[PDB]
């Protein structure tokens, strides 16, 4: 699923990513935008043989299991392929536990280079919440 951009405000919202460890709403829409382009069955593979799946772009090395990435862990205790679902709820309470790691939304890559420090409440503007 694409979502829209107010579509995925108000799902993620409603899932309670809103202020969660201290990052409002805008952090979370601007890092879908980045990671995904609000593509919930994106999928990227990187050097190390890991996979990045899904709108948060989650990661196999330590999150789930995709079944080959060897020497990996499955924190969030889910197949990979959950995360690709047009409901985001796998997605969602996995994040929570990444933002929770120590380094908060610094885990994302795209967070980091293109969101942190800028006007996030941009990507919230004219949704009704
Ligand atoms: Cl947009
Ligand atoms: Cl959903
Ligand atoms: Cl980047
Ligand atoms: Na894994």
């Known amino acids: 699923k694409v979502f829209g951009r107010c579509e995925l405000a108000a799902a993620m919202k409603r899932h309670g990513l809103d202020n969660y460890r201290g990052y409002s709403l805008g952090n979370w829409v601007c890092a879908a935008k ?15 043989g890991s996979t ?14 995709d079944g080959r990435t060897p020497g990996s862990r499955n ?4 197949p990979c392929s959950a995360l690709l679902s047009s409901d ?7 994040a929570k536990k990444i933002v929770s790691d120590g380094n908060g939304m610094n ?7 293109r969101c942190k420090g800028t006007d996030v ?9």
């Open 34 to 48: 980045f990671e995904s382009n609000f593509n919930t069955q994106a999928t990227n593979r990187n050097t190390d």
């Open 52 to 65: 990045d799946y899904g709108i948060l772009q989650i990661n196999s090395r330590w999150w789930c299991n």
């Open 75 to 78: 924190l969030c205790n889910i």
């Open 88 to 94: 985001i709820t796998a997605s969602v309470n996995c």
């Open 107 to 113: 885990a994302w890559v795209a967070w980091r280079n």
């Open 121 to 129: 409440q941009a990507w919230i503007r004219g949704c009704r919440l």
